[PDB]
From Swiss-Prot:
Residues modified to Phosphoserine: 49, 241-242
Gene: PTPN1
Function, in words: Tyrosine-protein phosphatase which acts as a regulator of endoplasmic reticulum unfolded protein response. Mediates dephosphorylation of EIF2AK3/PERK; inactivating the protein kinase activity of EIF2AK3/PERK. May play an important role in CKII- and p60c-src-induced signal transduction cascades. May regulate the EFNA5-EPHA3 signaling pathway which modulates cell reorganization and cell-cell repulsion. May also regulate the hepatocyte growth factor receptor signaling pathway through dephosphorylation of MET.
Descriptive protein name: Tyrosine-protein phosphatase non-receptor type 1
Source species of the chain: Homo sapiens (Human)
Record note on quaternary structure: Interacts with EPHA3 (phosphorylated); dephosphorylates EPHA3 and may regulate its trafficking and function. Interacts with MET. Interacts with NCK1.
Record lineage: Eukaryota, Metazoa, Chordata, Craniata, Vertebrata
Membrane topology: Peripheral membrane protein
Family (UniProt): Belongs to the protein-tyrosine phosphatase family. Non-receptor class 1 subfamily.
Length: 296
């Protein structure tokens, strides 16, 4: 079903055409809050904005704007917050959102520097000794430990509300080998990273929605979330034939614009779900097979 669709598109070579079909059909909603002149310096890219109905509001009286959208997958029963790579001035805003939304995980699918250009601010401490203080949002962030694997890094972070002295453990999942308008090296390595995020509980319902971001938070971020949702939908029904990836992407596109940026990214999305289905359909050993194939 998702493979007959795959082979049909591949042998014809119409990924670009299938993708335009998505681009044409995607929802269009007003971004009036994001476009206000006072929020000009809060957006990384002018042409990537959260819709007004699904945007996350910061819990402050001054300015509640942050370039972030809540993607609510009702059937899948999972919610994601997709945001841009924090700007130098929105780093406080970012962690304010994390604290307010009660997020357990932060998934980063981009590097700070990519293709020689700055794609995101250093918004978390790199060294245990030098913790970060965000004066504008009254928050503390300390690095507790990091586990650097060959292509991703998991970090344990301590977030502290300086107002109440309340503490929270944040997990930071940093994918380091995923190019800007590119794809992961293999479905094997991607899924391994996804299932590592899954294993932490950061996606579980007892926590606020996970924060997913790349540079703009639509391309790679959309790829991560689409794949996760599809697999989750497949798991709920135990019926791989029942999930229509294109339909899931369009459903997602109701909450945030331009999710998945290239036709190749869509091709990967299929590849990731088809392979991940194996683990969902009762083959537990492929989980360890992805870990061997990724060389982490």
């Amino acid at each position: 079903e998702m493979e007959k669709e795959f082979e049909q598109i591949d042998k014809s070579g119409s990924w670009a055409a299938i993708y335009q079909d998505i681009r044409h059909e995607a929802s269009d909603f007003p971004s009036r809050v994001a476009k206000l002149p006072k929020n000009k310096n809060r957006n990384r890219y002018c042409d990537v904005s959260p819709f007004d109905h699904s945007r996350i509001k910061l819990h402050q009286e001054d300015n509640d704007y942050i370039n972030a959208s809540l993607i609510k997958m009702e059937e899948a029963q999972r919610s994601y917050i997709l945001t841009q790579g924090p700007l130098p001035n929105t780093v406080g805003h970012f962690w304010e959102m994390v604290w307010e939304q009660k997020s357990r995980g932060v998934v980063m699918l981009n590097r700070v520097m990519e293709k020689g250009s700055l794609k995101c601010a250093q918004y978390w401490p790199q060294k245990e000794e030098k913790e970060m203080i965000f004066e504008d949002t009254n928050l503390k962030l300390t690095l507790i430990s990091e586990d650097i694997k060959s292509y991703y890094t998991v970090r344990q972070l301590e977030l502290e509300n300086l107002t109440t002295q309340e503490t929270r453990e944040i997990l930071h999942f940093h994918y380091t080998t995923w190019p800007d308008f590119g794809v992961p090296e293999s479905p094997a390595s991607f899924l391994n990273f996804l299932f590592k995020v899954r294993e932490s509980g950061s996606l579980s319902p007892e926590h606020g929605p996970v924060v997913v971001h790349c540079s703009a938070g639509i391309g790679r971020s959309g790829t991560f979330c689409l794949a996760d949702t599809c697999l989750l939908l497949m798991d709920k029904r135990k019926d791989p034939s029942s999930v229509d990836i294109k339909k899931v992407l369009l459903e997602m596109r109701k909450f945030r614009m331009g999710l998945i940026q290239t036709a190749d990214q869509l091709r990967f999305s299929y590849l990731a779900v088809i392979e991940g289905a194996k683990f969902i359909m009762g083959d537990s050993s492929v989980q360890d097979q992805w870990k061997e194939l990724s060389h982490e």
